[PDB]
Design an enzyme around this catalytic site. Structure first.
Site, PDB file in Angstrom:
ATOM      1  N   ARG A 108       1.628  -0.998  10.389  1.00  0.00           N
ATOM      2  CA  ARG A 108       3.014  -0.785  10.841  1.00  0.00           C
ATOM      3  C   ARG A 108       3.600  -2.036  11.476  1.00  0.00           C
ATOM      4  O   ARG A 108       3.382  -2.293  12.604  1.00  0.00           O
ATOM      5  CB  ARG A 108       3.062   0.354  11.853  1.00  0.00           C
ATOM      6  N   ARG A 164       0.861  -1.141   0.000  1.00  0.00           N
ATOM      7  CA  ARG A 164       0.000   0.000   0.000  1.00  0.00           C
ATOM      8  C   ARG A 164       0.930   1.232   0.000  1.00  0.00           C
ATOM      9  O   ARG A 164       2.154   1.086  -0.008  1.00  0.00           O
ATOM     10  CB  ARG A 164      -0.998  -0.008   1.190  1.00  0.00           C
ATOM     11  N   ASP A 174     -10.481  16.502   0.240  1.00  0.00           N
ATOM     12  CA  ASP A 174     -10.182  15.374   1.090  1.00  0.00           C
ATOM     13  C   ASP A 174     -11.323  14.343   0.985  1.00  0.00           C
ATOM     14  O   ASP A 174     -12.260  14.470   0.179  1.00  0.00           O
ATOM     15  CB  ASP A 174      -9.843  15.839   2.498  1.00  0.00           C
ATOM     16  N   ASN A 197     -10.194  11.932  10.040  1.00  0.00           N
ATOM     17  CA  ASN A 197     -10.032  11.051   8.933  1.00  0.00           C
ATOM     18  C   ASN A 197      -9.573  11.862   7.744  1.00  0.00           C
ATOM     19  O   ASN A 197      -9.550  13.053   7.796  1.00  0.00           O
ATOM     20  CB  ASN A 197     -11.305  10.294   8.563  1.00  0.00           C
ATOM     21  N   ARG A 225      -2.838  16.475   3.916  1.00  0.00           N
ATOM     22  CA  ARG A 225      -4.071  15.946   4.449  1.00  0.00           C
ATOM     23  C   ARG A 225      -4.210  16.479   5.894  1.00  0.00           C
ATOM     24  O   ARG A 225      -3.388  16.192   6.742  1.00  0.00           O
ATOM     25  CB  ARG A 225      -3.995  14.419   4.435  1.00  0.00           C
ATOM     26  N   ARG A 231     -13.445   5.934  -0.275  1.00  0.00           N
ATOM     27  CA  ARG A 231     -12.358   6.019  -1.247  1.00  0.00           C
ATOM     28  C   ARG A 231     -12.785   5.310  -2.519  1.00  0.00           C
ATOM     29  O   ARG A 231     -12.282   4.232  -2.868  1.00  0.00           O
ATOM     30  CB  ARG A 231     -11.081   5.411  -0.677  1.00  0.00           C
ATOM     31  N   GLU A 236      -0.646  16.025   7.297  1.00  0.00           N
ATOM     32  CA  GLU A 236      -0.255  14.675   7.067  1.00  0.00           C
ATOM     33  C   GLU A 236       0.076  14.471   5.596  1.00  0.00           C
ATOM     34  O   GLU A 236      -0.558  15.087   4.731  1.00  0.00           O
ATOM     35  CB  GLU A 236      -1.366  13.693   7.380  1.00  0.00           C
TER      36      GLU A 236
END
Ligand SMILES: *[C@@H]1O[C@H](CO)[C@@H](O[C@@H]2O[C@H](CO)[C@@H](O[C@@H]3O[C@H](CO[C@H]4O[C@H](CO[C@H]5O[C@H](CO)[C@@H](O)[C@H](O)[C@@H]5O)[C@@H](O)[C@H](O[C@H]5O[C@H](CO)[C@@H](O)[C@H](O)[C@@H]5O)[C@@H]4O)[C@@H](O)[C@H](O[C@H]4O[C@H](CO)[C@@H](O)[C@H](O)[C@@H]4O[C@H]4O[C@H](CO)[C@@H](O)[C@H](O)[C@@H]4O[C@H]4O[C@H](CO)[C@@H](O)[C@H](O)[C@@H]4O)[C@@H]3O)[C@H](O)[C@H]2NC(C)=O)[C@H](O)[C@H]1NC(C)=O
Ligand SMILES: *[C@@H]1O[C@H](CO)[C@@H](O[C@@H]2O[C@H](CO)[C@@H](O[C@@H]3O[C@H](CO[C@H]4O[C@H](CO[C@H]5O[C@H](CO)[C@@H](O)[C@H](O)[C@@H]5O)[C@@H](O)[C@H](O[C@H]5O[C@H](CO)[C@@H](O)[C@H](O)[C@@H]5O)[C@@H]4O)[C@@H](O)[C@H](O[C@H]4O[C@H](CO)[C@@H](O)[C@H](O)[C@@H]4O[C@H]4O[C@H](CO)[C@@H](O)[C@H](O)[C@@H]4O[C@H]4O[C@H](CO)[C@@H](O)[C@H](O)[C@@H]4O)[C@@H]3O)[C@H](O)[C@H]2NC(C)=O)[C@H](O)[C@H]1NC(C)=O
Ligand SMILES: *[C@@H]1O[C@H](CO)[C@@H](O[C@@H]2O[C@H](CO)[C@@H](O[C@@H]3O[C@H](CO[C@H]4O[C@H](CO[C@H]5O[C@H](CO)[C@@H](O)[C@H](O)[C@@H]5O)[C@@H](O)[C@H](O[C@H]5O[C@H](CO)[C@@H](O)[C@H](O)[C@@H]5O)[C@@H]4O)[C@@H](O)[C@H](O[C@H]4O[C@H](CO)[C@@H](O)[C@H](O)[C@@H]4O[C@H]4O[C@H](CO)[C@@H](O)[C@H](O)[C@@H]4O[C@H]4O[C@H](CO)[C@@H](O)[C@H](O)[C@@H]4O)[C@@H]3O)[C@H](O)[C@H]2NC(C)=O)[C@H](O)[C@H]1NC(C)=O
Ligand SMILES: *[C@@H]1O[C@H](CO)[C@@H](O[C@@H]2O[C@H](CO)[C@@H](O[C@@H]3O[C@H](CO[C@H]4O[C@H](CO[C@H]5O[C@H](CO)[C@@H](O)[C@H](O)[C@@H]5O)[C@@H](O)[C@H](O[C@H]5O[C@H](CO)[C@@H](O)[C@H](O)[C@@H]5O)[C@@H]4O)[C@@H](O)[C@H](O[C@H]4O[C@H](CO)[C@@H](O)[C@H](O)[C@@H]4O[C@H]4O[C@H](CO)[C@@H](O)[C@H](O)[C@@H]4O[C@H]4O[C@H](CO)[C@@H](O)[C@H](O)[C@@H]4O)[C@@H]3O)[C@H](O)[C@H]2NC(C)=O)[C@H](O)[C@H]1NC(C)=O
Ligand code: G39
Ligand code: G39
Ligand code: G39
Ligand code: CA
Ligand code: CA
Ligand code: CA
Ligand code: CA
Ligand code: CA
Lengths: 388, 388, 388, 388
Positions: A71, A37, A244, A266, A212, A290, A196
């Site tokens: 992560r 990703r 966004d 978000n 973001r 999305r 972000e």
């Protein structure tokens, strides 16, 4: 080789043409394709490559189960030839970690990967495929960076990092690197309230990053960096065309210096090209998820709080999954101007498609044309039922 | 490097020797081979490679189902090392799309891929592995091009495109590119009434293209291009040895300036070498289907409306599947003359073999000899029952 | 680069050390390894590679069924990195066909592949990875060549071919190539009565080939070539240590100018180094089958009809399958002498192991040491039951 | 290129950052990854690569059964790109055998592989990818070497070998190679009583090797080599922080010139950096098994028999499997000092995980930082149940 300088302006963007597409999820149904990703694209002087964060397993591998998770110790920044899929056998590991950026300065490439637990992460800055500098977490809360290419000017490559809350004030820093060493860093200034995942491009010795605001804003923050002075400003895209996701419906007047409210905690990585009338914004078509992707020409979006679209192009239908998107350019191309490019991450699997136990993506990427080209739509193209 | 000039004539063709063969369908029964069609061969100054349009799936992959279809978002022009198969891991993507051509000008390579929906397709012209020029559909009906290599002379690389009906008059254009830029284009002139899928070669500063009259003609149209003047003529091969497919039986007198009638609205890409007595024509052995392949020496085929064969060579038996065929040469070889070469696409799967759900091909390719060599036949070699 | 000259003598051979081993059949039980046979090794100035004739299928592929057969349209000469296996993805095709040789002349490589039906085969001679010369069958009965490397001197690369009966007199020719062109050819002369599959090496401007008398001889014919004069002699190895397979038991006196009788119409490719007291012969341990392999030091084997071993080394136990063997050297190594090397083809599958439907091999290769090293044995190492 | 000289000192080690990780066992659950053990890392002037001893089979291959065994004919030293897994298709074979070392001297690389039966093994020394020197067993009992990189200075590359008992006195030799030739060798001197598997690094024209006393010692022997004088000393690490495995609990006073007793006839390859206060020791966390891994800063460990830790870093949790570990550095990096690096072999499968029939590993590797970075733990990450 000399350091690249951002001497050119953007080409006039009258439409977008197809640049690359890997079809990774289709192909990896029956070949040894890594789960990824957070992809992006980045050029060297002699080649342009796809990049992403591997999950350290193939799609069809049993270790694909659980790859919605962000992560792990099994992630790495990989690159691979343009429009090939990220395979076990063709993917080059740039560095280890679960958040990254990379850029070429005209002499060689800098790659940055962050790893560690949430309260103790660290960046390693690689230059010429060797580790040079390390930066420890300053806020002990998921030190993290762009997830798309950085940009360099005369050897200075600014990078935006954030450490701290994703749902509240955080500590964003602009680092100015040269040959993988820290020249300077600055805390975020200006009127962006949260940053972000910045998407950056350069032209005429200025770097523009669209980021973001994960906390309050459905308009995107913009950081503009002077890589000579090593200074920056921030604000929001003023336009009421909100970009966004998720987001509220578009109003008739946006906000220049404030998050446009309605959705909290978000977002999605995205991008824009902000160049007066030659301004194009990317966004998901859906305001809720999305799904879909489109480019809209929004003259003076950055500065005009009532700017609306004058032209557009559908990239991904609203009935197809999208994802992250980001900017890159081939700074080493021929000609008189820099051709704007972008990619879209086409996320498949979890959480939207939860009959599979994995999350991965493929890539589509387009660059600008001075023609007014016909549009197609560019879905991922995999049939999820095949993976059951 | 200097631009290549077409300074040599063709070598005398007394027979054909085996040049390359990938066995792709045999090998891909149990390895990660991409589904393809519309293959060809093209040389750089230091290497010759196989090219084709991928379908963005492996043969054994579940996404192979439906690959009879021509124009999806999952197709790309790929190249790979001579006589290797097109695998996921060795295939280099040249550009994205579902109709292509490519050629090297002696300095670097130009590649052209067309994508889009039927009413809104666009060509992107790549040069030195970067996008340079874009061309929008002019007739809004499947803008499309050669499906084999273009040819260059002193940097000028003519390319033939068609846009419009496949079963009626269409708008064919000859574009003259240099360094991926448009110098000039011209509409088709001369007596060819319909043009598809030209197969080209160069010698003594002239480019000869043999094409497919999909509308009315079972004789093949020929375009001859002067790449210095950037002008062209068209006519048909005069010979009664008819070389499209499907086709009627051979008459005793052909047609120079008119489609030879009998079969409408179909055809196959093919090729010829038209060089006085040193003239060789390729065709399917079958008049009804894409089965078999042979070369016939037909002195003065282009200009002699009663010319019949004086020699021949079987390439593929009539009991084996063939497909498209096209010309290429190694313009950078040693010696005093250009050695004529060709490939045949050996189509497997649908529609002829419909117990599988895919369509793919392998490649065989031969070049001319000044010897009178023994002949073999060169089938694809895969057992379809293995794929069930 | 200049053409290599054979200026050095052989190093003293006191034992053999392991050089390369691919373990191809073990590895290909679960990876995309091509079926092969007739392997060899050959060096360029900067790299040494394994070579073999592919069967155009993987081992695990369904098309492996029937690969005992020698001469299909699906075979090609492939090369791949030393001690890697011949995989779909790493194997480079040199040319198409079912009998081959290859050598580097110090500037570039010549590769020769023969294809066709039995009564109409043809050699294509490739130089600098392009086809240059073609040779038609002269006896219309399986034109065929060395199945191991040729040797060059000042650009002249002699190659031995045979066309005609394998069980009777045939027409053997020595061709002298330079830059892939024919300088000269000669019919076989001297006292060798039948020649197949010569294994060659060069030293001090002489090329020595040890071949297979498939007709009557269980002693091996030897051809010695002067590549400057472009002339040759032939005889047999005089030694009573007989080195073909199958063969009768060793006598006490051999034959210099005559086949040593007892076994007809069979053999195996093999090799020797014939250098006075520094003479080593390879052979199968079994007199009946292609099992085991050993090297024997047989001072003056070529010229002494009572010469017996003074030293030896076991390469493959008699309880393991062997196969073809051949000579090569790294002509571009450092130092004052050429280090003798050889390979053994370790055949697996049919006909000896007929519970599988395929025939393939792996490779082991050793070079000489001036030490007296300890010996190991080097089997293929695959468990055939795994493939059932 | 000139020979590299060890002109720099070690960088100050304040923590360790992640350098590479291949995730080989996770990825090889569903891709063609070779079984390995005894991995290491080694740099050339332009690239750093992973190395290991292949077992000549894939993990998922049926030939993986039995790969706990150390010394078969199917093993080879392989290298592959940093942080990629060792796949069939990307792994380069350096030489054949079952014990190895390798290092680059600044001009080219020397690789050493030992093969043979226990009573008759031999080393082959490769230089510039060609065999140059061979060494026969001197004690006829598993001639064997470092299993990690050697180090060079002005072309002289010392290598430590052992031949003889693993549980008693043996015959250890230091060989001094240059261009793959033997300049000199010496028997072990000093107070180390047994040497295995040395892990070496260079700084300021001295090479320091930390080794494994398999016989009596749970403190590690240290050999220090002057590569100009071609002389050496040996002793033990004096520190009571004991760093072999298995081992007794740490005492308060160690032994400088004697094995620290308590555990016999076992051990594990390991390493240290011994640089006054800048001294860091690696060890397993467990005293009983190869589980966990940690680095401890132990000022003056080499010389201070009461030295205890002042800082540390966990690399692998005690609930995860570790394995061998060894030193390397990038001698060709920029800057004023050599950055200490190490790897840990993360062994999976037998004997600890005996529900699978194989033994393999993955690699994690870290280099030193002058920052005080946050720590993570770096497990192999494969789920063994997936392989059942
Ligand atoms: C072959 O391919 C070609 C090339 O791709 C295809 O042609 C393309 O066709 C597409 C689809 O039509 C076009 O995209 C749209 O473009 C319009 C903008 O152009 C229109 O408006 C222009 C500006 O008008 C205003 O200003 C001018 C002066 O500056 C003034 O003159 C005018 O009166 C007015 O005040 C016009 O200039 C323009 O006209 C020109 O072009 C026409 C051709 O398109 C031509 O006919 C004319 O002669 C003239 O030359 C034209 O009228 C975008 O507005 C549009 O985007 C909106 O709509 C889509 C859905 O279609 C939506 O997804 C977008 O997000 C966006 O709408 C949302 O956001 C708005 C802004 O806030 C909001 O107002 C909307 O309500 C809407 O909001 C809702 O949805 C969003 C998203 O889900 C959500 O977030 C909100 O909350 C809310 O729910 C498209 O981008 C291409 O520009 C066009 N390209 C070219 C070069 O022509 C061709 O069709 C293909 N051929 C075939 C046969 O298929
Ligand atoms: C080892 O390998 C070697 C090398 O490959 C093999 O030798 C090769 O053998 C093949 C097979 O025989 C040959 O291919 C055929 O060649 C002939 C042409 O050569 C013949 O005709 C020549 C011209 O004759 C005319 O003019 C001359 C003067 O110019 C005049 O002298 C003469 O009287 C006459 O008017 C002759 O010169 C030639 O003779 C020479 O060569 C002979 C050796 O071949 C030798 O014996 C002689 O001494 C002399 O030296 C010879 O007679 C092609 O015509 C032929 O192609 C037709 O036939 C095949 C089927 O075999 C078909 O597929 C083709 O399409 C074509 O026939 C169709 O099209 C025609 C044209 O419209 C039509 O007229 C036909 O009715 C037919 O049409 C039908 O089918 C098509 C296709 O399905 C369909 O579209 C229509 O509608 C209709 O249904 C072959 O190409 C090679 O040339 C030959 N090569 C060499 C160098 O020798 C050797 O056999 C191998 N050895 C072994 C042991 O196997
Ligand atoms: C660690 O590794 C090292 C290094 O590899 C190992 O040491 C190696 O050990 C092997 C196995 O022993 C040796 O291979 C054999 O070598 C002999 C030759 O050496 C012997 O003979 C020499 C010559 O003797 C004659 O001349 C000399 C003077 O020149 C004269 O002095 C003498 O009296 C006599 O007239 C001797 O010089 C030599 O002695 C020297 O070396 C000894 C060590 O080996 C040492 O002890 C002595 O002090 C001295 O220094 C020695 O006696 C080969 O003959 C032999 O090959 C035959 O046997 C094997 C089976 O073992 C067979 O496969 C071969 O094909 C061959 O025998 C067949 O062919 C013959 C010829 O026609 C025929 O006569 C035989 O009947 C037989 O034929 C049958 O089978 C074949 C094949 O199936 C078939 O075709 C026929 O029809 C028929 O059925 C081996 O090659 C190495 O040389 C040796 N290397 C070194 C450097 O020492 C060491 O063992 C390993 N250590 C451990 C612990 O394992
Ligand atoms: C974010 O990441 C950061 C960076 O990684 C994390 O911070 C790291 O935290 C770890 C874990 O705490 C630290 O590792 C340990 O370090 C200590 C050493 O530091 C301590 O001791 C120092 C020396 O003290 C002595 O001398 C000084 C003067 O020189 C004197 O002042 C003092 O009074 C005393 O006499 C202290 O200086 C040091 O204090 C400093 O740092 C502190 C932060 O750590 C700070 O709070 C202070 O202000 C000051 O600045 C500190 O007290 C190691 O000792 C330790 O290793 C032992 O323990 C682990 C288990 O945790 C064990 O596995 C090790 O093997 C070792 O213990 C074994 O071996 C010993 C030696 O023989 C033996 O004595 C022990 O009994 C024990 O033996 C047993 O187990 C072994 C192994 O199984 C077995 O073989 C034996 O037989 C027996 O069974 C750890 O390495 C890092 O140094 C630290 N790094 C940094 C830069 O701060 C941070 O925690 C992360 N943040 C979060 C939120 O998670
Ligand atoms: C940690 C906050 C951050 C941005 C809001 O989360 C990102 C959101 C993601 C997302 O919205 O899809 C995926 C990213 N991989 C993740 N980043 C990290 C480093 O885990
Ligand atoms: C045709 C005669 C020739 C030598 C005797 O047969 C060879 C024997 C072989 C053998 O003995 O194994 C295998 C070879 N692939 C074959 N050569 C060809 C070209 O088919
Ligand atoms: C032979 C003694 C030696 C060191 C003690 O054994 C090693 C121990 C090993 C181990 O402890 O895991 C594995 C090594 N592969 C092995 N070396 C060889 C050459 O077999
Ligand atoms: Ca937001
Ligand atoms: Ca037609
Ligand atoms: Ca024989
Ligand atoms: Ca597979
Ligand atoms: Ca020990």
């Amino acid at each position: 080789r000399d350091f690249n300088n951002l001497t050119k302006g953007l080409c006039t963007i009258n439409s977008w043409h197809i640049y690359g597409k890997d079809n990774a999820v289709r192909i990896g149904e029956d070949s040894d394709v890594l789960v990824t990703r957070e992809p992006y694209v980045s050029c060297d002087p002699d080649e342009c490559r796809f990049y992403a964060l591997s999950q350290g397993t193939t799609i069809r591998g049993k270790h694909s189960n659980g790859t919605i998770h962000d992560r792990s110790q099994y992630r790495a920044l990989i690159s691979w030839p343009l429009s090939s899929p990220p395979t076990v056998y063709n993917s080059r590991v740039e560095c280890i970690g679960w958040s990254s950026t990379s850029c070429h300065d005209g002499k060689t490439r800098m790659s940055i990967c962050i790893s560690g637990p949430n309260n103790n992460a660290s960046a390693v800055i690689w230059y010429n495929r060797r580790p040079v500098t390390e930066i420890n977490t300053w806020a002990r809360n998921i030190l993290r960076t762009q997830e798309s290419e950085c940009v360099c000017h005369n050897g200075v490559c600014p990078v935006v990092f954030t450490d701290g809350s994703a749902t509240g004030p955080a500590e964003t820093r602009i680092y100015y690197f040269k040959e993988g060493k820290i020249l300077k860093w600055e805390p975020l200034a200006g009127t962006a309230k949260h940053i972000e995942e910045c998407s950056c491009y350069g032209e005429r010795a200025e770097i523009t990053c669209t980021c973001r605001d994960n906390w309050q804003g459905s308009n995107r923050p913009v950081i503009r960096i002077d890589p000579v002075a090593m200074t920056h400003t921030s604000q929001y895209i003023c336009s009421p065309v909100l970009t966004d996701n998720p987001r509220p419906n578009d109003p008739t007047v946006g906000k220049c210096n404030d998050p446009y409210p309605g959705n909290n905690n978000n977002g999605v990585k995205g991008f824009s090209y902000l160049d007066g009338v030659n301004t194009w914004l990317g966004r998901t078509i859906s305001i809720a998820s999305r799904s879909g992707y489109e480019m809209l020409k929004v003259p003076n979006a950055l500065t005009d709080d009532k700017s609306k679209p004058t032209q557009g192009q559908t990239i991904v239908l609203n009935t197809d999954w999208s994802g992250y998107s980001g900017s890159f350019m081939d700074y080493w191309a021929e000609g008189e101007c820099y051709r704007a490019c972008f990619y879209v991450e086409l996320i498949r699997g979890r959480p939207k498609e939860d009959k599979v136990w994995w999350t991965s993506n493929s890539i589509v990427s387009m660059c600008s044309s001075t023609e007014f080209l016909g549009q197609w739509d560019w879905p991922d193209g995999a049939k999820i039922e095949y993976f059951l």
